[PDB]
Paper text:
Biogenesis of the large ribosomal (60S) subunit involves the assembly of three rRNAs and 46 proteins, a process requiring approximately 70 ribosome biogenesis factors (RBFs) that bind and release the pre-60S at specific steps along the assembly pathway. The methyltransferase Spb1 and the K-loop GTPase Nog2 are essential RBFs that engage the rRNA A-loop during sequential steps in 60S maturation. Spb1 methylates the A-loop nucleotide G2922 and a catalytically deficient mutant strain (spb1D52A) has a severe 60S biogenesis defect. Nog2 is an essential hub enzyme that acts as a key quality control element during the nucleoplasmic maturation of 60S, anchoring both the pre- and post-rotation states of the 5S rRNP (Nog2pre and Nog2post) via extensive rRNA and RBF interactions.
Author numbering:
A (entry chain y): 1 to 244
B (entry chain I): 1 to 131
C (entry chain b): 350 to 448
D (entry chain m): 136 to 472
E (entry chain r): 2 to 74, 85 to 96, 117 to 261
F (entry chain V): 2 to 137
G (entry chain b): 1 to 299
The structure:
RNA sequence: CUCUUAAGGUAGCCAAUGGAUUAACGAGAUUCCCACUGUCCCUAUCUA
């Protein structure tokens, strides 16, 4: 369940989109091809919402959330907030956050149960994350790399970290998140995996430049297809050895 | 408009703001960090002898002592006494987020205020002892 | 060769979690999602996509999408309602409140 | 022909030197593959770690400054060829601190190829800046190729003046058919040609300055009724093995027109002794060039506005002192046999 | 695509449906187009077109002559076959050259008030061991760019031209002053090294120096051409 | 608009002509950037090329790591001190002029950006928005 | 590695190159000079003519020299392939002729600018400029044969398939008419011709496929006869060099129905003769055309 | 008849010093740096 598409000839899907288990957010720029690419996989099962954050298109980088809540930065206008509320059902809470780190998608890497945050967020922001998203919160870096939301892609099934993450850090973060983690690249050698792709428990979307070994690793770690667990690493070891 | 005000308050010659200096003085950890700085070659006095209130580096301990024995430092200390005038003050003056401003003022009076005063007293006695 | 050993190991290893608490974290899949039918590009009876609607109306760059058509409101007649913003120098949004 | 080798009318259908057998063919191909892989590793050590990787990030090295091209102008080289064409004797002036560095080998080759009747000798100037044994060793080694005379140029307190004068009188007596002989002084800039001429004349007849390019046109000086001396502007022959750092450290360019002298200060550290540097600048305790510059600036009071040390100014002064001889240094002569 | 993919495409799919007819009609129009080009092209392009037409016509006539000739129908050793290659001078009289043309006045001084230096504008031979005189005493100036050392010497027998070094300037016909200055103009008798020509006398002596006469103007064409006097 | 930029760019008041020095906002070790060229600049007699927020320039490092110095690299302007108009209805400006080091494809050399980042630059360059922690 | 050499600019022949450079000089430089002008202006006019023509010839020669590959510096497989195709000796000799012509043009330009410094009249300056251009033209006209050879070589070498000698490779070899091109068509999307006569394929053909998320290249080679290397020809030398150089999996194809025109004894003999070629490479023997006759019901 | 390449391991012997690489001064001539700025991008406005 891993697909490839582009937003106006750009492979950075996570920059221009946000994907949870219950809703999807897409930028309003240009045609309807990006929205239709999401709609071909999602149908009418979950709402897909055209939105802007502070008049910009970088909604996956400016916002963060999961199936229970959505956090928007303080630069979000009242009209955008009202549009999001009218588009989404009551089961999704919506909160505007007074946080200095306005790039919520960059500074928060979360799923339905756990969250990794920037080590310098406000205490009130941390408590608001715990209250709205309903998740445990940990101040962490991905092997010394701040902006965990842009350098990690996380779901309830697994996680993909940037390839410069040490094995000890991978083990520590895997213990914190209670999901299997793997280090890898997306979009043909890019290290910004969280801004490169979006993923939930049943769908992953990457750029067109993502190679076959990268797509296979993504499917293995996020457990997308029916016969694709995280233990097919032994089967894909030969391909990964040839690729690396 | 005039040349003096232009060449003093040009954008590229801006100085640190009172609310930021108040936040620096509020916590003891920040005071310790600003007192113990790494040796920087781009700062006067190798980054040492730094007055937090004026946000100003001195080349020598005698320069810092003379700065402390001065009306400019006293003016800055007098300015740093009350509420630091955030956006909430102007909002409540206009009639906006009045409860938030009142809660902020109460928290400043109760928790932030006396701790900042004690940190300032400790910094003063430390400078007196080391000078 | 011993040169391509440590990098290969570090990129082939998959870290595994271990307990740390007795809290169940299960993946969430909606019933509509798991009952959704697979989209077929070559199928006489397929869903009409947004790009299809755009192409049949104006095409890319001409079609003006109504963003209020997806609103989940109590009354369907309230979709095309203009929300007031300014009244006598006040913002209506910071007065808007239940009860 | 090419037409038979390849094209519509080609007649070549078999290899000219066919392989003896498949075993020889596979052995030759395996050897060629091994040599190719070794060569690829050898060039990946330097060139791929250098030039190739820079284009991936779009980085380009900054333009080479024109202050390093001084001494290579057409007017200067026309003057050089004029003085050679007018000279019967040519004195090549070398610096005793770096004589092989300050040699014009291409000019020597041109003289020995095209003008074999012109007599070329070496004068090793600034011998007061090296130990006695270093100068003796350099004289001995250079005498294996050309007659070399040690010298120290000064109007008042000089060395070698009488030896040079008697050698010139010998040349004049050898060319007794000629009514006079001309001796042209060539070499690198700042090696002291004008100083040597002023020493011979016991009078300041040619302008002398530490700045390169002080002499811009040729000058005739009457030493005796039968002996003329020709002062010439300094020349820097173009080369690829000589880098900008070597050109700067040979006293060729003006330090005031270089961009970053702080990066050349490590050259001073590698060329000078620690004891000599600490005696000259009354400082110690540095571990690198940046620390040396910072300590010297703070001791000398070269602080910019705001307490920042003046790295560029201190570096320029250090380079000027190195070139003008306020720091002792020399290049070791070749080993004795 | 790889190898001869266009030829493979022609073999597998053919060409455009009107290709043959269009090519035939263009080749039929070619005569009218050639005539219109000849009558319409102006200037340099017209001159070049006429020149190329003349060359093509000459080539066609030669081809026709060769075909008609075909349809109508040194006593070297074995090792040399199948291998290929009065006492009057040839120029007894040449154009006279005055001193005004020969020399150029060179002015000296800050106000350029002195005019005693003269520069030779023709090519010269200065010999071996030449050193320029000091500038204060240099009246006659022979610039280095005009100095020659070699010449293209043509032998009448065997019809070969060799690049030979110049040995001396024997006689410049204009003036003995030019002869002793070494001026190389047309009609000048020079001495050349003929070592590579392999000439042997009757007595077995190897000839390595002979006389030649300059047949061109080196100041005009940048080179010295001479004919060996045999 | 330059290679790697995401779409078209509307006009912003130019604040940095050739010869200006701006701060370096990334963590690659450079301290300041000296502008020598502006990518996409037009041509007019006597007129200096100038860059605004969200433009790509060619810069040389003056202060920072010596390995980074003595080289010309692409940079993207993320802050400017000259006030410019936003279409939402306000003129605004930053404290300083600041840029980040990038590649011709618009990818950051560093891993994070310190300080605020302009909305226009973040929207025009996806990698800047990915490495930004503060966007206005 | 570069692996492809299509981006080589067109090499004009001698007369066309002469026309291009000389007419570029005549068009792009001013053409009106008067005998009543200053001698400095006249000299500068003719110097500019000579220098511009020399620069044009030199830049054409440099565009030729930079474009073509260095035969000795490429991978040995590519070196052997280009030696078989284009005769490396002639290749290097033609390129060296181009380089020497460039040097001669530079020398003529420098010498005649220096001579034009001393021109005394418009007639003399015109003669010196005409002499410089005529000498350049003679130098260029001496390059008639290498330029034509290089143009043909460029056109051929721009269409060579790109082969990576360090990637995963399946070589296909055997006698003619056994099914090598048919197998390449089956496993790839290459458009190699399949015809029932020997040596339909006269050069290496490349196809690609994906197995276990990895890219593999398959190489179809022309047929090999059971002959020694002394009487072996260039078409077979292509296959021999490919087998010797490309560390790969070699598939030797055999026809048991002998409809290829070669007996089973001859095919076994050819396999044993090319046996020393595949050392430290994977080897597999594929028996094709099993729909006609199977290995089980053989004699 | 003969002449010059004996000098040796980062400072020598020989007579504090081995000097004009001379301090200070200058409406003398020249180069560079910090600061500074309408010299410039690119010009606008005010007074007599
Ligand atoms: N110590 C020492 N310095 C010298 C000697 N000869 C010249 N210098 C210095 O070198 C500098 C440049 O000399 P100069 O004659 O202008 O070099 P030129 O370019 O060859 O003419 C002058 O400032 C002199 O003081 C020498 O024999 N000994
Ligand atoms: N019956 C049958 N014929 C085949 C098979 N493979 C190839 N051929 C025939 O063999 C002829 C030539 O084969 P080709 O592909 O050109 O072999 P190549 O010369 O080695 O490239 C074609 O006309 C095919 O019809 C096969 O598997 N079965
Ligand atoms: K000098
Ligand atoms: Mg001089
Ligand atoms: Mg101008
Ligand atoms: Mg075939
Ligand atoms: Zn103070």
């Amino acid at each position: 369940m891993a697909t490839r598409t582009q937003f106006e000839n750009s492979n950075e899907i996570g920059v221009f989109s946000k994907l949870t288990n219950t809703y999807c957010l897409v930028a309003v720029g240009g045609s309807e091809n990006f929205y239709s690419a999401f709609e071909a996989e999602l149908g009418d099962a979950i709402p897909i919402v055209h939105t802007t954050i502070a008049g910009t298109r970088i909604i996956g980088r400016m916002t963060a959330g999961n199936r229970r809540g959505l956090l928007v930065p303080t630069q979000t206008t009242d009209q955008e907030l009202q549009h999001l509320r009218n588009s989404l059902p009551d089961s999704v809470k919506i909160q505007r956050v007074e946080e200095r780190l306005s790039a919520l998608g960059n500074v928060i890497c979360c799923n339905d149960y756990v969250a990794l945050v920037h080590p310098d967020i406000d205490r009130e922001t941390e408590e608001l994350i715990s209250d709205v998203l309903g998740v445990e919160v940990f101040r962490q870096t991905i092997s010394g790399n701040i902006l965990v939301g842009s350098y990690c892609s996380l779901s309830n099934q697994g996680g993909l970290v940037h390839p410069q993450t040490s094995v000890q850090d991978q083990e520590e973060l895997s213990s914190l998140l209670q999901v299997p983690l793997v280090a890898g690249t997306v979009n043909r050698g890019s290290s910004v995996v969280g801004a490169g792709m979006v993923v939930n428990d049943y769908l992953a979307v990457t750029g067109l430049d993502t190679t076959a070994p990268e797509l296979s690793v993504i499917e293995s770690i996020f457990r997308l297809q029916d016969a694709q667990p995280e233990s097919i690493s032994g089967n894909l070891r030969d391909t990964l050895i040839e690729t690396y | 408009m005039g040349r003096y005000s232009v060449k003093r308050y040009k954008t590229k010659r801006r100085t640190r703001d009172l609310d930021l200096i108040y936040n620096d003085l509020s916590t003891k950890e920040s005071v310790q960090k600003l007192l113990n700085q790494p040796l920087d070659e781009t700062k006067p006095g190798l980054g040492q002898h730094y007055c937090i209130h004026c946000a100003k580096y001195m080349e020598t301990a005698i320069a810092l002592k003379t700065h402390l024995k001065g009306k400019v430092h006293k003016r800055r200390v007098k300015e740093l006494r009350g509420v630091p005038y955030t956006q909430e003050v102007s909002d409540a003056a206009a009639g906006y987020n009045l409860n938030k401003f009142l809660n902020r003022v109460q928290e400043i009076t109760q928790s932030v205020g006396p701790e900042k005063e004690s940190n300032e007293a400790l910094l003063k006695e430390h400078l007196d002892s080391t000078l | 060769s011993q040169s391509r050993i440590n990098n290969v190991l570090n990129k082939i290893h998959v870290a595994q979690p271990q307990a740390r608490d007795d809290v169940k974290r299960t993946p969430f899949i909606p019933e509509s999602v798991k009952n959704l039918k697979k989209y077929d590009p070559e199928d006489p009876n397929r869903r009409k996509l947004a790009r299809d609607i755009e192409a049949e109306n104006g095409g890319a760059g001409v079609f003006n999408v109504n963003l209020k058509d997806k609103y989940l409101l109590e009354d369907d007649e309230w979709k095309n309602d203009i929300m007031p913003e300014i009244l006598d120098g006040k913002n209506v949004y910071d007065f808007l409140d239940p009860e | 022909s090419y037409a038979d080798a390849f094209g519509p009318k080609a007649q070549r259908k078999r290899p000219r030197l066919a392989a003896s057998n498949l075993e020889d063919l596979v052995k030759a191909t395996n050897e060629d593959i091994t040599k190719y892989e070794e060569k690829q590793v050898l060039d990946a050590t330097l060139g791929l770690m250098g030039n190739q990787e820079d284009k991936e990030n779009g980085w380009t090295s900054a333009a080479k400054e024109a202050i390093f091209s001084k001494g290579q102008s057409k007017r200067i080289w026309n003057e050089l060829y004029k003085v050679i064409d007018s000279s019967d004797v040519v004195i090549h002036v070398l610096d005793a601190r770096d004589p092989l560095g300050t040699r014009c080998k291409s000019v020597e080759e041109y003289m020995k190829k095209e003008t074999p009747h012109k007599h070329l000798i070496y004068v090793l100037n600034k011998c007061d800046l090296v130990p006695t044994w270093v100068a003796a060793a350099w004289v001995k080694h250079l005498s294996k190729e050309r007659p070399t005379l040690a010298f120290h140029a000064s109007i008042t307190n000089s060395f070698g003046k009488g030896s040079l004068i008697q050698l010139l009188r010998q040349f004049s007596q050898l060319h007794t058919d000629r009514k006079q002989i001309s001796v042209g002084f060539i070499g690198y800039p700042n090696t002291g040609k004008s100083s040597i001429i002023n020493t011979l004349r016991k009078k300041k007849v040619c302008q002398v300055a530490p700045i390169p390019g002080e002499t811009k046109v040729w000058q005739y000086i009457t030493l005796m009724k039968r002996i003329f001396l020709i002062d010439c502007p300094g020349i820097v022959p173009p080369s690829s093995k000589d880098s900008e750092e070597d050109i700067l450290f040979r006293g060729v360019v003006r330090v005031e027109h270089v961009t970053h002298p702080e990066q050349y200060i490590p050259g001073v550290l590698k060329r000078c002794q620690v004891k000599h540097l600490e005696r000259t600048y009354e400082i110690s305790g540095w571990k690198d060039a940046t620390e040396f510059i910072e300590i010297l600036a703070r001791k000398q009071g070269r602080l910019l506005k705001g307490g920042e040390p003046d790295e560029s100014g201190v570096s320029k002064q250090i380079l000027n002192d190195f070139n003008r001889g306020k720091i002792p240094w020399f290049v070791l002569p070749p080993e004795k046999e | 695509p790889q190898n001869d993919y266009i030829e493979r495409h022609i073999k597998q799919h053919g060409k455009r449906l009107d290709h043959e007819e269009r090519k035939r009609k263009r080749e039929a129009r070619e005569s009218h187009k050639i005539s219109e080009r000849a009558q319409k092209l102006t200037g340099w392009k017209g001159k070049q077109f006429a020149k190329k037409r003349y060359a093509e016509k000459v080539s066609m006539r030669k081809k026709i002559k060769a075909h008609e000739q075909s349809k109508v129908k040194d006593a070297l050793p074995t090792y040399l076959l199948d291998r290929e290659q009065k006492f009057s001078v040839p120029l007894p009289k040449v154009r006279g050259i005055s001193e005004e043309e020969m020399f150029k006045v060179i002015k000296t001084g800050k106000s350029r008030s002195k005019s005693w230096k003269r520069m030779i504008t023709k090519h010269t031979f200065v010999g071996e061991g030449f050193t320029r005189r000091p500038v204060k005493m240099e009246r006659i100036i022979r610039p280095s760019a005009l100095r020659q050392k070699k010449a293209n010497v043509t032998h009448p027998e065997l019809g070969v031209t060799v690049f030979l070094p110049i040995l001396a300037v024997k006689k410049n016909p204009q003036s003995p002053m030019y002869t002793q200055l070494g001026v190389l103009t047309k009609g000048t008798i020079i001495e050349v090294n003929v070592s590579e020509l392999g000439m042997v006398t009757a007595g077995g002596k190897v000839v390595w120096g002979k006389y030649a006469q300059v047949t061109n103007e080196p100041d005009r064409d940048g080179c010295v051409n001479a004919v060996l006097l045999v | 608009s330059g290679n790697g930029a995401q779409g078209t760019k509307f006009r912003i008041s130019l604040g940095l002509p050739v010869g200006a020095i701006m701060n370096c906002a990334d963590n690659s070790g450079a301290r300041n950037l000296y502008i020598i060229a502006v990518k996409g600049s037009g041509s007019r007699l006597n007129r200096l090329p100038a860059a605004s927020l969200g433009d790509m320039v060619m810069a040389t490092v003056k202060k920072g790591k010596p390995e980074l110095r003595k080289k010309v690299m692409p940079a993207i302007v993320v802050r400017q001190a000259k006030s410019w108009r936003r279409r939402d209805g306000v003129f605004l400006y930053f404290e300083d002029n600041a840029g980040v080091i990038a590649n011709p494809k618009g990818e950051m050399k560093g891993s994070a950006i310190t300080g605020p980042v302009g909305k226009e630059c973040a929207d025009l360059w996806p990698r800047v928005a990915s490495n930004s922690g503060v966007v206005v | 590695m570069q692996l492809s050499w299509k981006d080589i600019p067109t090499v004009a022949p001698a007369n066309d190159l002469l026309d291009i450079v000389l007419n570029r000089t005549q068009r792009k430089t001013p053409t009106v000079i008067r005998p009543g002008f200053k001698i400095t202006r006249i000299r500068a006019f003719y110097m500019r003519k000579v220098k511009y023509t020399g620069e044009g010839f030199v830049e054409k020669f440099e565009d030729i020299l930079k474009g073509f590959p260095n035969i000795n510096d490429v991978h040995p497989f590519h070196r052997d392939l280009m030696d078989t195709l284009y005769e490396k000796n002639h290749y290097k000799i033609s390129l060296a002729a181009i380089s020497r012509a460039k040097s001669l043009v530079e020398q003529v330009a420098r010498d005649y600018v220096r001579l034009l410094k001393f021109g005394q009249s418009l007639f003399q300056c015109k003669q010196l400029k005409r002499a410089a251009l005529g000498r350049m033209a003679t130098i260029v006209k001496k390059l008639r044969d290498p330029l034509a050879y290089l143009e043909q070589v460029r056109q051929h070498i721009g269409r060579l398939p790109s082969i990576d000698p360090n990637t995963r490779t399946l070589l296909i070899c055997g006698y003619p008419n056994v099914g090598k091109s048919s197998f390449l068509r089956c496993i790839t999307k290459s458009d190699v011709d399949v015809q029932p006569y020997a040596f339909t394929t006269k050069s290496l053909y490349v196809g690609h496929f994906d197995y276990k998320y990895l890219r593999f290249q398959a190489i179809d080679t022309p047929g090999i006869l059971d002959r020694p290397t002394e009487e072996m020809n260039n078409i077979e030398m292509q296959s021999i060099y490919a087998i010797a150089h490309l560390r790969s999996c070699v598939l030797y194809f055999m026809d048991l129905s002998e409809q290829c025109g070669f007996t089973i004894e001859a095919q076994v003999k050819l396999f044993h003769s090319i046996k020393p070629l595949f050392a430290n490479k994977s080897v597999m023997v594929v028996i094709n055309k099993t729909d006609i006759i199977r290995p089980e019901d053989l004699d």
